[PDB]
Amino acid sequence: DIYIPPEGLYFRLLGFASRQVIFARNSPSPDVGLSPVNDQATDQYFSLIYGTGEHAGLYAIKSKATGKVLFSRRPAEPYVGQIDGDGRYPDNWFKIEPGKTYLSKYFRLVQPSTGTALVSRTHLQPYFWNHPQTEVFDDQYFTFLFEDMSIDKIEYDLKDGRILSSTPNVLATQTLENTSSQTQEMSFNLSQTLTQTSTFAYTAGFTIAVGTAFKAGVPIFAETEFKVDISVDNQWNWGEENTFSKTYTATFSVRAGPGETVKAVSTVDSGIINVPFTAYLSSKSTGFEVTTEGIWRGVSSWDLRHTLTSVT
Amino acid sequence: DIYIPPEGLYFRLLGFASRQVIFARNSPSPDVGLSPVNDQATDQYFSLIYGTGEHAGLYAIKSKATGKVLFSRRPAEPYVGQIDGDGRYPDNWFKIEPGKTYLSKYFRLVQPSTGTALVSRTHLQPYFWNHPQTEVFDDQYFTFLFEDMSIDKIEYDLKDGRILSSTPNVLATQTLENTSSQTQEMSFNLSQTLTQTSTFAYTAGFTIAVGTAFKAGVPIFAETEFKVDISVDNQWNWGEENTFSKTYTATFSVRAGPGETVKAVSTVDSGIINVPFTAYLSSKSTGFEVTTEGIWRGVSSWDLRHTLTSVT
Amino acid sequence: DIYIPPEGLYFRLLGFASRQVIFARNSPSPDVGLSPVNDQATDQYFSLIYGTGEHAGLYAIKSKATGKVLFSRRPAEPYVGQIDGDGRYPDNWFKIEPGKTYLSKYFRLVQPSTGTALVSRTHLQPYFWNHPQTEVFDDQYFTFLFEDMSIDKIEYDLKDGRILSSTPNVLATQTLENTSSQTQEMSFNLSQTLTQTSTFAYTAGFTIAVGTAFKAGVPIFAETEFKVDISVDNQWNWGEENTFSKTYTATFSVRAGPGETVKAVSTVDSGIINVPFTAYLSSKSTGFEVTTEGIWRGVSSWDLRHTLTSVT
Amino acid sequence: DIYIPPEGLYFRLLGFASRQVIFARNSPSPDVGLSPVNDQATDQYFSLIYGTGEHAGLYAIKSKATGKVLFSRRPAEPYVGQIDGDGRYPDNWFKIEPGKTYLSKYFRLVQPSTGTALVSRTHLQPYFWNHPQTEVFDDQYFTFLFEDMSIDKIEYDLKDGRILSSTPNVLATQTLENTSSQTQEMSFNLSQTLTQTSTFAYTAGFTIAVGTAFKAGVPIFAETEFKVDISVDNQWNWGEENTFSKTYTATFSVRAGPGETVKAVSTVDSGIINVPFTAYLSSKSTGFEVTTEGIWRGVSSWDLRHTLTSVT
Amino acid sequence: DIYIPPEGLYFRLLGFASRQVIFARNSPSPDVGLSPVNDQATDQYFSLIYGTGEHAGLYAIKSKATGKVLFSRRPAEPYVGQIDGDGRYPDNWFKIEPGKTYLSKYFRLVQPSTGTALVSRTHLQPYFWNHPQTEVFDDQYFTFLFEDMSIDKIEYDLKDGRILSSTPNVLATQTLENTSSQTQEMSFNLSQTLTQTSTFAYTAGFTIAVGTAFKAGVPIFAETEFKVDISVDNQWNWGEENTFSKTYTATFSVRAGPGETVKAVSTVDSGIINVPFTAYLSSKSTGFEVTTEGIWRGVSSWDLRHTLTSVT
Amino acid sequence: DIYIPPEGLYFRLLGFASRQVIFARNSPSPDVGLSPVNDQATDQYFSLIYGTGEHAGLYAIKSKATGKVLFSRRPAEPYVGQIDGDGRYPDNWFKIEPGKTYLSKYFRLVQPSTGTALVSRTHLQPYFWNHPQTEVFDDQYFTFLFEDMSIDKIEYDLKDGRILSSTPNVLATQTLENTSSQTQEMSFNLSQTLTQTSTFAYTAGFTIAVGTAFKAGVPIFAETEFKVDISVDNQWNWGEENTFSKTYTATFSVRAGPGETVKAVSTVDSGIINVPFTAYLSSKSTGFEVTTEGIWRGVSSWDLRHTLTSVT
Ligand SMILES: CC(=O)N[C@@H]1[C@@H](O)[C@H](O[C@@H]2O[C@H](CO)[C@H](O)[C@H](O)[C@H]2O)[C@@H](CO)O[C@@H]1O
Ligand SMILES: CC(=O)N[C@@H]1[C@@H](O)[C@H](O[C@@H]2O[C@H](CO)[C@H](O)[C@H](O)[C@H]2O)[C@@H](CO)O[C@@H]1O
Ligand SMILES: CC(=O)N[C@@H]1[C@@H](O)[C@H](O[C@@H]2O[C@H](CO)[C@H](O)[C@H](O)[C@H]2O)[C@@H](CO)O[C@@H]1O
Ligand SMILES: CC(=O)N[C@@H]1[C@@H](O)[C@H](O[C@@H]2O[C@H](CO)[C@H](O)[C@H](O)[C@H]2O)[C@@H](CO)O[C@@H]1O
Ligand SMILES: CC(=O)N[C@@H]1[C@@H](O)[C@H](O[C@@H]2O[C@H](CO)[C@H](O)[C@H](O)[C@H]2O)[C@@H](CO)O[C@@H]1O
Ligand SMILES: CC(=O)N[C@@H]1[C@@H](O)[C@H](O[C@@H]2O[C@H](CO)[C@H](O)[C@H](O)[C@H]2O)[C@@H](CO)O[C@@H]1O
C-alpha cells in the first residue's frame, strides 16, 4: 500500500526503464528531459501538490528548481513539459498507479482527462514523453528517489519486546582454581565476546533508503524487561543485517569454606530478540519531518549468571 | 538446476543486457526484434517445442502471435527471424545454457549446428541478432518472464511441520482481582495481540514470480500437530516476508475457595515454525496447470495457557 | 541429657521394677511405701528442692501431702522414710543418676554421704528400701511421671520451615467440558480430599507425656512462606503420628474463545514438610509454667494450580 | 529369623513374665534362681554350647560364674538346676523356640527328651522352674540381654547410597549489595544452619541394644558420590532418630562490571538420604568380635550453590 | 476412639498392672481369677453381650468356657465372679472406660449400678477383685488381647495412591560398548537391585496385633496408575517396617548407525509411596469376619528408562 | 569499509550506469572503451598499482592485456586512455571513492591533480570519458567484478560455534512392539529425514561473488562441541541459503524383562546453529591467494536419543 509523500517533501522520479531521472529547468534550451542522478542538482527535485475538489486523489508534480508543474497531453505539441499555475490546467493532474511483482515499488503517472501516461526511456526518442494510457509498457513506470533525510531519533516500543528463541550458552566453565584448604583468596576473571546481530526492518511510514547509515541505540533484554544499550556505538545500515561484538567482563573472588576447590561457571541466555520502533527523520535542506515504523531484530544475550561450587 | 517450462506454458524472453523482450509478429515491417514489456501484447509471448530424435534435449521457440518458430544461422541473411514448420529446419533448435553467479537465473540460447548464440542488446544494432557461440558476452543471456499465473491452491504437508524455536511468552500476568473472602464472582478478560510472520519460500517446480500477491491459509501448531488457520485473511507476497496480527481473546471467572485473592497468568509458546507445501497454479489465459513446492516459515504462537492461583 | 524439673513442678517417682509409685503420708500407719498410680492421690506427688552450697548439684525430695523430705541412711532403722526440715540432714540429699539403654529415661536416686541407693521393688520386702550404692540392680531405677500439664499454646518458628520432599499431584484432570463454538458458559467444580499427616516430636525442654491430647494449629506452606492453618480442628496426640483430611474446593468458569473445548487441570504440590515450634504449658493444679521445644513434621500439600486450555 | 549368639558371647536370660534374669552360682545355698539385673554380677551371665551329632540344632546353657550347665527334667527333683560336664546328660540340651507378635523377640527354652519347658515367673514358686512343654504359658518366654558390647567401627557401603527425596532450599537470598557503578569490592557472607537427621537402623547380624551410645561418622552426598562427614561429632543412639546441626559458611566477593547491583543466592539440595553399613563390635570383657548390618537414614543437604547476577 | 468388638469375637482381658489375664472355669475350686496367657486355654476367652434397653451402651462379659457372665458388686461376697443368665442381673453390665496417655489402649470395666470397678493386680489379694469406682488406680485397667485372626485378604484402594517424593536414580550408566564403525551387534545387560520398604499401618477397624505375620501383595506405581506387584513374596509384619529386594533386569542391543560408540543409561524414579487399603480377617476357630482399614507406605521405584546415544 | 584488491589480483571495472566494463587493448583502432562482459577477454582485466610517496593512498589501473596504465586529464585530448610507465605521470593516480545507499558497493575513480572523475555511460558519447570531479553523476560509479576465484578450503572456527535456538523434535514415537511375555527379540528401525539449512555469509576479506558454487564441509553440534560433517556432499551457493537432507538411521532390539510391551521414542534436538569460518581462495589463472572471513548459519539437529520403556 504505497507511500506517497506529503506536500513538503522532495524526491526524484526515477524511471524503471531509463534508470534516469526527470529534470525541469528554465535553461538551457531543453527545459525538461532525463538525466543520470546528481543529488546536488535542484533541477531533478520535485514535490507533490495534493489535488482537491474533483481532483481529490490526484496530484500535480511541482519542479523545485522552476516552481512550475508538469503536464501530459495528446493534442498539442509537445505532449509533456512545464507550466505556471499550481495545477491551473486539467493537464497537470496525475493518478499514481502502483505496479506489481518487479514493479511493486514503481508506478505509472497517468493523466486521466487526456488518457495519457508518462514515459521514461533511453531506447527511443523523445526520452521523456507520454503514451496512450491504455497501452502499458515497462518504460511508463517510476519510483520515488527521496531527498536525503537525516535519522534524528529511534524510539523503541520496549513494552512490546519479544524473545523468539532462548538457549543457555556457557561463556566460561573452566575458571576453577584450588589450594586445598585454609587459603583465603580465589578470584576469577571473565572476558567473553559474542558476535551479536542487528537489523532495522521497515514496517510502515516513510520509506527510508536501504543502506542509509545511522547510529547506535540497540535493544537488550534485562531480566523482566527490554532496555536500550546505549553503549553499542556501531554504525547501522537501514534495512540490512549488521553485526557487533558484545564482551562480558566480570571479576569475583571466593574462599571461606572448610577447605575446597572452587569452580566458577559463567553463563548467559542467548537467542533471537525483536522489538518495534519508530524513527524520526527530517529533511536536510528543509527540516521537514516524517516518521517510519519498523521492527528491530537480532541475536542477543541476557541474564549473565555466575555459579560458585566447591569440590573435594 | 533450472526450470524449463513444458510445451503448453507461455513466457517472455527477457534479455540480461537489453532488459527488453523478444517479439515476433506478422506486421508491421520489422517482424522480429526487441521491446519493453507489455503484458497485453501477444506479440511478446512464446512457448517451447521439445525436440525429439536427434533433437532430444533441444528446443524450438514458437511465437504465440504468429505460430512461427525462431531461427539462428550464420550463412544467410538475416541471421535471425521467424519461419513456418514447427522445427522443420536444423536452424530452429536451441540448447538452453544456464549461466553462473549473477547469471544463474539466465541462460544462453545456442543453436548448435550453426554454432551461433542469440543476442539481445540495446547498445549496438541489430538489437536482436546472434554471435559465434564460442565468444561469450553478457548480452547473450536471457531469462524467463512467465505468463501471469493464478495461484489456485496451497496444500501444506502438515505431517512434516517443525518447531525451530520455542520460548514461553507471558501475554498477561497482572489480571489478578480480589475481594477478601466470600464474594462469588471474579471474571478475567484477555486480549493480547502478537505480530506474526509469514514467508512462502520456493523450493522446486514452477518458478512463481517474486511478489506475486495471493491469499490466506497459514500454518499453526495445535498441541501435537500442525493445522491451518483459515482465519488469517492477509494478502501474501510470494517469496517475501509478510507480517500479520494474531489476537488472543479469553474470558474466564473463578471464586469458590474459603476466601482468596485470585491471580490469572495467560501464557503462550512463541517461536519460529516452518512447514512444507505445494502450490497449484494455472494459466489465466489457458488454464494450463503447474505446481511449485516450497517451505513456509514464520514466527508463531501456540498452546495458550491460563493458570489460576489463590493468595492470602 | 535428662530433664530435671525445677522446684515448683510436681511428679510421681515410678519404679522401673516395681512399676509402682512412692507415697508419703502422715497416716495410716505405714507412712511411706509403694502404690499403684492414683492421679488424685496427693499422697503420691513430690517436688524437688535444689541443693546449694556443698549440696549444689543434689536434690531433696519433698512430699506434697506432708511437706516432709525423704531420707536414705544405713546405720539407723528404718533406712528410708520422711523427716521435717527442708533438707536439714545430709541424709536428705540425693544424686540423680541417669541409666543407659532401656534405662535411659530412668535414673537412680543415690544418697552420697551414706553410699546408699533408693530401692523400689515388689518381689522382696521392704518394697521401698535402699541398697549399698556400689551394687547396682534394676530395681534402683526411677523415672518421672509428671503431674497433669495443660498445653496452652503452640508457637511455630515459621521462618525456619523446610520442604523435605515435593512432587506434583494432579487432583483432577478430566473436568473438561465442550459445546463446540459460541456457547458462553463452562464452569468447573473441584472437590478433592487428601489425607494429611501430623506429628509433634519432642526436641528439648519439658518432657510432655506421650499421647497427651491437645488441639489444632498446624503448619502449611504458602507460596514463599510457611503459615498456620487454624482450620484443622483435629485432636493431636503428642509424640505420635496423626492423620487429617484436607479438601480442596474450587469453582471457575471460562468460555470466550472463537469456539473450543475447554480442559481444566487442578494440581497441587504434595510432600513432606517440617517446622520447629515451642509449646507452653502450665500446671493444672498450680499454673506453674514450663516450655517444650519440638519439631513438627507432616505430609502436606501446597500451591493449588488451575490450568485452562482449549482444544479442537 | 532370630539371632542366636555363637559360643563365645555372653548374655543374660531375661524372662518375659518375671522381667528377671536367671542366675547360677556355687553359693549361697540357692545356687540357681531369678534376680533383678546387675550387670556386674558374673552370676547372671551365660553362653551357649552348640550341640552336635544327634544334638545338632540344640544348645546347652553354660554358666559363666560356675562353668556348669543348666538342666530341665521331670522325674527327679529338683526339675531344674546346674550340673558338670559340658552337656554330658540329655537333660542339658535345649531347643530355642521363637514366639510371635509381642513375643517375637522372645523364645521358649524347651528340653525335648523330657518334654519340659523352662519357666521364669514371680507370681508363683518356684520362680525358676519348668513345665510340660505341651502347655504353653507366657512365663516360659525368654529373651537375650547380651553383654555390654563396644561399637568399634562403622563402615558405610557408599556405592549403594540412595537419594530418597530432593528439593532445593534457598539458604540465603537477600545478601545483595550495590554501589551504583565503579566501586570495586562487594563481598558476601553466608552462615546458615540446618537441623539434620540421623538414624542407624538394624538390618541383620548382632542385635545391638537399642539406645546404645556411640560416635560420629555420618553419610553425605557429594555431587556424584556419597562420602563420610567425619566432622559431625554428635553422640548417636542405636536404633533411634537423632538430630544434629549443619552450618554452611561462605564468603565471596565480586564487582567488575560496567556498574551494577550484585545479588547473591546461596542454595542447597535438601532431602532424605540412606546408606547401608556394617558395624564392628567386640566384647568389653573378652574382645569377642561380631558384626551387625544396618541401613542409615537421614534428612540431609548437598550441592551448595552460589549464584551471582547484576541488576540496573 | 477405641475399638470394641462385636458380639461374636473372642478376646482375653489383659490387666495393665497384673500383666495377667482373667479366667472363668467350672472347676477346679477357684473358678475365676488371673493367669499368665495360654492361647490354647478356652478358659481365658470371653466375648461381649451388647446391652439394650436401659443397658444400651453397656456390656456383659460372657465366658467362652462356661458360658456364664461376670459380675461386680459391693454388698454380697465375693464381690466378683460368674453367674448364669446372659445378663439377668444389673451386676452384669459394665461401662468400658478408655484411659489416657500410657493407658490410651486400656480401659476400666466399671459396673455403674454398684459403683464398682474391676481390679486386676498381683501385688495384693484377691488378685481379681473390684474397687469403689470413684478411687482410680492403674490396676483397674484392661486391654483387649483378641483371639488369633487370619488375614485372608488385602485390597488396595489404588485410585487413591500417592507419590510423596520422587528423584531419579541412575541404576547403571557405564554399560557403554564400542567397535568404531560397521560392526553389527552391541547388546547390554541390566541387573540392579534396590532395597525397597514396606509398612502396613493401622487406620481404623479391627485392631490387628502388631507383628502379625502375613503375605505378599504390595503397591507399585505404573506410569499413570498404581498397581499391585504380586511377585513380592516376602513375609510382612503388621504395623512394622519391612524391607525387600527389587531387581531390575533388562537386555537390549543396538548398532545400526554410520559407526558410533553406543552408551546406555538405565534410570528409574525412586521415592516414597503410599496407598490406602482394607484387610479382611476371620476367626481361626469361628470364621467370624471383620475388616481393618489402613494406609500402606514404602520406598519404591518406577518408570525404568533405557536411553541410547552414540558418540565419536 | 570497502575491499580494495592487492596488487596481484585481477578484476573488471563495471559501470553502475553503463552496466558495461572498461577495456584496454593495443588494437583495433579504438584502444580503450566500454564493452559487455566477456570473461575470456584479457582485454577487460586490470589490477592495481598501490601508490607510494606522495601517491600513497592512491592507485594506478594497469591493463592486463597491454600492461599500460589508465589516465584522466582535462587539458589535452583525449581526456582518457592508456600510457606506458607504471604511473610515471600524475595523470595515472586515482582516488577510490565509495558511494552510499544503492552505491555502497560502487565508487568513483577520481584523479585528484586534474580534478577529474572517470565516466562510464551508454546514453551519451564518449561512453568512456571523464567529468569535473565536483559535479557528481551516477555514471561516475564503478564496482569490482573480480576474476574467477577458486574456493580451495573452508576452515571453521569450531571453538566459537553457537546454538541460537533449541527444541526437541520427536523423530519417531510409535515404533512400539509387544508379544506379552517371554518372547525374546524386539528390534526397531529408525529412518527419519530432516530438511536442513545452510548459508555461508560474508563477514570480511575478499568479496566472493554471490552464488559462487563450491562444495561440502558443514558444521554440526556433537554433544559438547561443534564438528564438521564431511558427509554432506551438496553444492553450496556463496551468500545464499541452501537446503539439504539429513537422515537418521538406527536399529536396536530389546526384550529381557518379566514380560512387557516395549516402546521406543527416538528424539533429536533441532534448532538454529552458526559458526565462524575462513575461506581460502586462489586465482584460477595465477594462483594468487586471498582469504575471506564469514559466519555460517543453519537449521540443524543434534543429540539423537533412543528411550526404551516397558508397559503392561
Ligand atoms: C514522438 C512520438 O509520439 N513518438 C511515439 C513513440 O514513442 C511510440 O513508441 C512507443 O512508446 C512506448 C511508451 O510506453 C514504448 O516506449 C514503446 O517501446 C514504443 O514503441 C509510437 C507508437 O508505438 O508512436 C510514436 O512514434
Ligand atoms: C550485423 C553484424 O553481424 N554485426 C556484428 C556485431 O554484432 C559484432 O559485435 C558484437 O556482438 C556481441 C554479441 O554477443 C556483443 O554485443 C559485442 O559487444 C559486439 O562487439 C561484431 C564482431 O564483434 O561483428 C559484426 O559487426
Ligand atoms: C531389710 C534389708 O536390709 N533387706 C536387704 C535386702 O533387700 C537385700 O536384697 C537385695 O536388694 C537389692 C536392691 O537393689 C535387690 O532387690 C536384690 O534383688 C536383693 O537381693 C539383701 C542383700 O542382698 O540384704 C538384706 O536382706
Ligand atoms: C513345684 C511344681 O511342680 N509346681 C507346679 C506349678 O508350677 C504348676 O503351675 C503352673 O506353671 C505354669 C508354667 O508355665 C504357669 O506359671 C501357670 O500359671 C501355673 O499355674 C502347676 C500345674 O499347673 O503344677 C505344680 O503345682
Ligand atoms: C478384699 C478387699 O475388699 N480388699 C480391699 C483392698 O483391695 C483395697 O486395696 C486397694 O485396691 C486398689 C484397687 O484399685 C489398689 O490395688 C490399691 O493398691 C489397694 O490399696 C483396700 C482399700 O484400699 O480395702 C480392702 O482391703
Ligand atoms: C566530449 C565531452 O567533453 N563531453 C562532455 C559531456 O560528457 C558532458 O556531459 C555530461 O557528463 C556527465 C558525466 O558524469 C553525465 O553523463 C551527464 O549526463 C552529461 O550531461 C557535458 C557537460 O555537461 O560537456 C561535454 O559535452
User: Nearest residue on chain C to E121, judged by CA atoms?
Assistant: C36
Contact (CB<8Å) A164/B270: yes
Q: How far apart are CA A70 and CA E147, in angstroms?
A: 119
- Listed in sequence order, the residues at least 6 apart from E118 whose beta carbon sits closer than 8 Å to its beta carbon are E70, E72, E80, E94, E108, E109, E110, E111, E128, E130, E140, E142
* Pair F160, F293: CB distance under 8 Å: no
Q: How far apart are CA E194 and CA E301, in angstroms?
A: 8
User: Nearest residue on chain A to B165, judged by CA atoms?
Assistant: A165
Ligand 2 geometric centre to CA of B27 (Å): 26
Q: What is the CA radius of gyration of chain B?
A: 29
Query: What is the number of alpha carbons within 13 Å of residue A75 lying toward its C-beta?
Result: 3
Q: How far apart are CA D33 and CA A225, in angstroms?
A: 87
DSSP strand pairing (B69-72 vs C167-172): unpaired
Contact (CB<8Å) C251/B255: yes
> Which one-letter amino acid corresponds to residue F279?
A
Q: How far apart are CA A306 and CA F299, in angstroms?
A: 30
Q: What is the CA radius of gyration of chain E?
A: 29
| Best CA proximity match to D129, nearest among D121, D119, D137, D117 | D119
Sign of the alpha-carbon torsion through C271, C274, C280, C285: positive
Residue F149: count of CB within 10 angstroms of its CB: 23
Q: How far apart are CA C174 and CA C170, in angstroms?
A: 10
Q: How far apart are CA D181 and CA D175, in angstroms?
A: 18
| Best CA proximity match to F284, nearest among F155, F154, F151 | F151
- Across chain F, how many H-helices and E-strands are there? 0, 24
> What is the largest distance, in Å, between two alpha-carbon atoms of chain F?
103
Q: How far apart are CA E90 and CA E93, in angstroms?
A: 6
> What is the largest distance, in Å, between two alpha-carbon atoms of chain D?
103
Residue A283 per-residue DSSP state: E
Chains in contact with B, where contact requires at least 3 CB pairs less than 8 Å apart:
A, C, F
Torsion angles phi and psi, residue F38, rounded to 5: -145, 95
Residue E254 per-residue DSSP state: -
Query: What is the number of alpha carbons within 13 Å of residue B149 lying toward its C-beta?
Result: 28
Q: How far is CA A304 from CA A243, A310, D262, in A?
A: 20, 20, 11
Q: Which residues of D touch E (CB under 8 A)?
A: 17, 100-102, 104, 121, 123, 135-139, 162-166, 203, 271-272, 276, 295
Pick E136's closest partner by Cβ from C40, C165, C243: C40
- Listed in sequence order, the residues at least 6 apart from B124 whose beta carbon sits closer than 8 Å to its beta carbon are none
> Which residues in chain B are closer than 8 Å to C308, comparing Cβ atoms?
252, 305-308
> Which residues in chain D are closer than 8 Å to C104, comparing Cβ atoms?
211, 237
Q: What DSSP string runs through F148-164?
A: PEEEEEEEE-GGG-EE-
Residue E75: count of CB within 10 angstroms of its CB: 7
Q: How far is CA C127 from CA C73, C132, C133, F217, in A?
A: 16, 16, 17, 100
> Which one-letter amino acid corresponds to residue E95?
K
> Which one-letter amino acid corresponds to residue F201?
A
Residue E128 per-residue DSSP state: E
E167-200 in b/e form (b: 16+ CB < 10 A) is beeebbeeebbbeeeebeebbbebebebebbbbb
Residue whose cell numbers read 507471558:
B170
* Pair A60, A4: CB distance under 8 Å: no
> Which one-letter amino acid corresponds to residue D160?
D
Residue B133 per-residue DSSP state: T
The C-alpha cell at E221 is: 506405581
Ligand 2 geometric centre to CA of F122 (Å): 16
Residues C141, C142, C143: CA angle, nearest 5 degrees: 135
Pick D271's closest partner by Cβ from C104, C138, C165: C165
Instruction: Catalogue the long-range contacts made by E188-192 (C-beta closer than 8 Å, 24 or more residues apart).
Output: E188/E250, E188/E251, E188/E252, E188/E253, E188/E264, E189/E250, E189/E251, E189/F256, E190/E248, E190/E249, E190/E250, E190/E251, E190/E266, E190/E306, E190/F256, E191/E247, E191/E248, E191/E249, E192/E247, E192/E248, E192/E266
Cis before residue A219, ω within 30 degrees of 0?
A: no
Ligand 4 geometric centre to CA of F108 (Å): 130
| β-sheet bridge partners, residue F14 | F21, F143
Q: How far is CA B4 from CA A248, B143, B281, in A?
A: 53, 10, 16
The C-alpha cell at A299 is: 541475536
Looking at all shown ligands, the one closest to residue E132's CA atom is 5
Torsion angles phi and psi, residue F119, rounded to 5: -125, 140
* Pair E135, E39: CB distance under 8 Å: no
Collapsing DSSP to helix, strand or coil, B105 comes out as coil
Sign of the alpha-carbon torsion through A205, A208, A211, A217: negative
| β-sheet bridge partners, residue A213 | A237
Q: How far apart are CA C90 and CA C113, in angstroms?
A: 7
* Pair F72, F66: CB distance under 8 Å: no
| Best CA proximity match to A220, nearest among A176, A260, A163, A135 | A163
Chain breaks in chain C (C to N over 2.5 A) after: none
Residue whose cell numbers read 552391541:
E186
Collapsing DSSP to helix, strand or coil, B110 comes out as strand
Contact (CB<8Å) D166/E167: yes
Instruction: Give the CA-trace dihedral at F147, F153, F154, F158, to 10 degrees.
Output: -150
Q: How far apart are CA C311 and CA C178, in angstroms?
A: 9
The C-alpha cell at A226 is: 527490554
Instruction: Give the CA-trace dihedral at D235, D237, D239, D241, to 10 degrees.
Output: -70
Give the CATH number of domain F1-147: 2.80.10.50
Pocket of ligand 3 contains residue C129 by CB under 6 Å: yes
A213: part of which helix (H) or strand (E)? Answer: strand A213-215
Sign of the alpha-carbon torsion through A233, A239, A242, A248: positive
Pocket of ligand 1 contains residue A119 by CB under 6 Å: yes
Q: How far is CA E151 from CA A244, E208, E218, E241, in A?
A: 77, 9, 15, 18
Ligand 4 geometric centre to CA of A286 (Å): 128
Q: How far apart are CA A177 and CA E310, in angstroms?
A: 33
Burial of F229 (0-12, 13-18, 19+ CB in 10 A): middle
* Pair E45, E64: CB distance under 8 Å: yes
F173: left (phi over 0), alpha (psi -120 to 50) or beta: alpha
Q: How far is CA A199 from CA A277, B167, F108, in A?
A: 12, 21, 28
Residue B178: count of CB within 10 angstroms of its CB: 16
A280: part of which helix (H) or strand (E)? Answer: strand A262-283
- SS3 assignment for F1-18: CCCCCCCCCCEEEEECCC
Domain ranges of chain B: 1-147, 148-312
Q: How far is CA D230 from CA A51, A65, D217, in A?
A: 94, 95, 5
Torsion angles phi and psi, residue E139, rounded to 5: -75, 10
Q: How far apart are CA F200 and CA F295, in angstroms?
A: 6
> Which one-letter amino acid corresponds to residue B254?
V
> Which residues in chain E are closer than 8 Å to C194, comparing Cβ atoms?
162
Pocket of ligand 5 contains residue E91 by CB under 6 Å: no
- Listed in sequence order, the residues at least 6 apart from D155 whose beta carbon sits closer than 8 Å to its beta carbon are D277, D278, D279, D280
Give the closest-approach CA distance of C271 to chain D in angstroms: 9
Pick C104's closest partner by Cβ from D211, D271, D272: D211
The CATH number, out of the four listed (2.170.15.10, 1.10.760.10, 3.30.1360.70, 3.40.30.10), of the domain defined by the range E148-312: 2.170.15.10
The C-alpha cell at A105 is: 515499488
The C-alpha cell at E207 is: 485392631
User: Nearest residue on chain D to A227, judged by CA atoms?
Assistant: D312
| Best CA proximity match to D158, nearest among D55, D296, D38, D6 | D296
Q: How far apart are CA D245 and CA E281, in angstroms?
A: 46
Q: What DSSP string runs through F237-288?
A: ETTSEEEEEEEEEEEEE---SSS--EEEEEEEEEEEEEEEEEEEEEETTT--
| Best CA proximity match to D58, nearest among D29, D34, D94, D23 | D94
> Which residues in chain D are closer than 8 Å to C166, comparing Cβ atoms?
165, 167
Residue E50: count of CB within 10 angstroms of its CB: 14
Residue whose cell numbers read 489480571:
B175
Residue F94 per-residue DSSP state: B
How big is chain B, counted in residues?
312
Looking at all shown ligands, the one closest to residue F109's CA atom is 6
Q: How far apart are CA D224 and CA D242, in angstroms?
A: 26
Q: How far apart are CA D202 and CA D5, in angstroms?
A: 16
Instruction: Catalogue the long-range contacts made by B4-8 (C-beta closer than 8 Å, 24 or more residues apart).
Output: B4/B48, B4/B59, B4/B96, B5/B47, B5/B48, B5/B144, B5/B146, B6/B48, B6/B50, B6/B290, B7/B47, B7/B48, B7/B49, B7/B50, B8/B47, B8/B283, B8/B286, B8/B288
Burial of C113 (0-12, 13-18, 19+ CB in 10 A): middle
Q: How far apart are CA C135 and CA B138, in angstroms?
A: 123
Ligand 2 geometric centre to CA of B108 (Å): 16
* Pair D215, D236: CB distance under 8 Å: yes
| β-sheet bridge partners, residue F56 | none
The C-alpha cell at A56 is: 481529490
Atom of ligand 4 nearest to the CA of D117: 14
Q: How far apart are CA E225 and CA A89, in angstroms?
A: 88
| Best CA proximity match to B108, nearest among B93, B119, B92, B122 | B119
Pick A138's closest partner by Cβ from B37, B164, B209: B37
Cis before residue F132, ω within 30 degrees of 0?
A: no
Pocket of ligand 2 contains residue B139 by CB under 6 Å: yes
Pocket of ligand 4 contains residue D129 by CB under 6 Å: yes
Q: Do the chains F and D touch each other, judged by at least 3 C-beta pairs below 8 angstroms?
A: no
The C-alpha cell at C250 is: 474450587
Pocket of ligand 4 contains residue D119 by CB under 6 Å: yes
Q: Which residues of B touch C (CB under 8 A)?
A: 187, 189-190, 222-223, 227, 231, 249-258, 303-312
Per DSSP (E only), the strands in D139-225 are: 141-146, 149-156, 162-163, 167-172, 176-177, 187-205, 213-215, 218-221
Pocket of ligand 3 contains residue C131 by CB under 6 Å: yes
Residue A209 per-residue DSSP state: P
* Pair B186, B254: CB distance under 8 Å: yes
* Pair A155, A281: CB distance under 8 Å: no
| Best CA proximity match to D6, nearest among D291, D220, D312, D311 | D291
Contact (CB<8Å) E165/C194: no
How big is chain E, counted in residues?
312
Q: How far is CA D267 from CA A308, D109, D306, F241, in A?
A: 10, 58, 7, 46
- Listed in sequence order, the residues at least 6 apart from A242 whose beta carbon sits closer than 8 Å to its beta carbon are A197, A198, A199, A234, A235, A236
Atom of ligand 3 nearest to the CA of D35: 18
- Listed in sequence order, the residues at least 6 apart from C221 whose beta carbon sits closer than 8 Å to its beta carbon are C161, C163, C227, C273, C300, C302, C303
The C-alpha cell at F251 is: 536399529
Interface mutation target, options E102, E127, E165, E272, chain C, most CBs of C under 10 Å: E165
Q: How far is CA F254 from CA A190, E110, E253, F177, F307, in A?
A: 48, 70, 6, 10, 11
Q: How far apart are CA E227 and CA E28, in angstroms?
A: 56
Q: How far apart are CA D204 and CA D198, in angstroms?
A: 19
Residue whose cell numbers read 548398532:
E255
Q: How far is CA D101 from CA D21, E98, E149, in A?
A: 22, 23, 12
Atom of ligand 5 nearest to the CA of E126: 1
Ligand 4 geometric centre to CA of E41 (Å): 14
* Pair F116, F133: CB distance under 8 Å: yes
Contact (CB<8Å) A271/B38: no
Ligand 6 geometric centre to CA of F191 (Å): 68
Q: How far apart are CA A118 and CA A80, in angstroms?
A: 8
Experimental technique for the deposited model = X-ray
B237: part of which helix (H) or strand (E)? Answer: strand B235-237
Residue whose cell numbers read 484443622:
C232
Instruction: Give the CA-trace dihedral at F34, F35, F41, F47, to 10 degrees.
Output: 40
- SS3 assignment for F16-55: CCCCCEEEECCCCCCCEEEECCCCCCHHHCEEEEECCHHH
* Pair B281, B238: CB distance under 8 Å: no
Pocket of ligand 6 contains residue F252 by CB under 6 Å: no
